[model samples]
Target: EVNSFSGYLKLTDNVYIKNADIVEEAKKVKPTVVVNAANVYLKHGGGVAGALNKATNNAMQVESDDYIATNGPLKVGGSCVLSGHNLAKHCLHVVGPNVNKGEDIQLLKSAYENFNQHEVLLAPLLSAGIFGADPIHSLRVCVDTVRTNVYLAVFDKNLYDKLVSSFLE
Candidate 1:
């Protein structure tokens, strides 16, 4: 029987490689659209190292250029930041809630609300490191501050599942 899940969801599944494989598999599966959240950096080796490390311990396949074709222009408020993170080819660097700009909470809330209204899932790879904030606390604050349900992909299967179920419920 088909599962009743809203969408196929998996976590801690080593997205970098699996994502590429999915793209290839998509050639056969022919899903209407594939949304990727892998983040890459052209400056600092990007998330390649992190992804490779995960691959070594996971059962996922690694592939190159999973997100290359999806790389496109990103609109961050009024400014646009080019995707440089090599973790994936397509990325949108959203400058959400500049804490220093006095709209940290509002911006974060607005971003989440907007994404939720559109049923967008987020895979913030460096949500913690890049912001120089506590990972757990940062995520909690961002989620709580918003008015919509967001699906955040963590590196833990249990946690990811829990979050997904909770959000959908």
Candidate 2:
């Protein structure tokens, strides 16, 4: 079975939970880690607000359960920056490219083609599933991609340090 701090999350099979309500399920698992996938946002219309409401509500409950959540695959407009508004202990918002700008494609291509070695990694380990892989792997992929893109860009030393510490400690 899968080994983790809490227990094994069974995602090896083809089980998928699309847009599933997580409030109750999260309480049941009391997960230690949570991965927020791409395209997550909080707007007024029928786009991301609905999803954000659901996710934030569930995440708030999970936070009470001592679960830590992290976001992945940053886009132009999303809810990655709204950390204090959610229940997650922390949120790592990574901004990538927009669709028309070819940044999104490059991010995915770099993540799959280069980082994960074309091994068909999951969709940034978000969504509802039994065995979601470690979110850090995806974060590492994004960090590596950014590091390669802008070597001189002043990286967030504090955030980088925190992430590294989180991964190791």
Candidate 3:
């Protein structure tokens, strides 16, 4: 996608989320890794995934599900990642729930959790659907994963303002 410095910004004693366009903003933060919710197909489907795809010259699409899968792209080997090329350093592919079917918070939360990267610039995951997640909800999820160094790169101005007020004070 499109959007730190020191890999974090001090919002409060604990908050570390920052507001910026992921593709452009990531240049300053220099995160070793950037996180995106993805389908196992490496299609860079939508939300943050598509933006990231466009930025990195469709890096994920190149790694398509060409495997001799036991079932399909979403099956076997479970979650995975596509390599980073342009904007940031690397990319992590955490499979998100099919929010179109319903708001699968647990699956979304599951995807949000356990990304083993310290310098991460977080992006919006399954928050585009119901329950009105916007940006703040995604930031909370990132914070929960790695409270100290997680930086959220947000694009929308309205949402940006909201987060800036919430974190930047």
Question: Which candidate leads the pack in lDDT?
Answer: 3
Tell me the TM-score of each prediction against the true structure. Answer: 0.35, 0.29, 0.69
**Which candidate achieves the best TM-score against the true structure?**
3
The local lDDT score (0 to 100) that residue 33 gets in candidate 1 is 22
Ranking of all candidate structures by their lDDT, best first: 3, 1, 2
lDDT of 2 by residue, 54-152 (tens): 657554334322322344333442223334233233333322333443434334433222222211111222211222323344344444443211111
lDDT of 3 by residue, 1-169 (tens): 2333544456545445445566665555556777665655666566577777787677556654443143356531135544666655666666666645554555545665546444344554335433344456665565565443455555666766676676544
Clashing pairs in 3: 1-52, 2-21, 2-22, 2-23, 3-21, 3-22, 3-23, 3-26, 4-29
The whole-model lDDT of each prediction reads 0.33, 0.30, 0.55
Model 1 lDDT per residue over 1-169, tens place: 1111223344322111112232223233332222232222211123422343243232111232332235533222221223322222222233344333343444444443334332222334223334343344545554554343333434545544444455455
Off by over 4 Å in 1: 1-45, 48-93, 97-107, 110-114, 156-169
lDDT value, candidate 3, whole model: 0.55
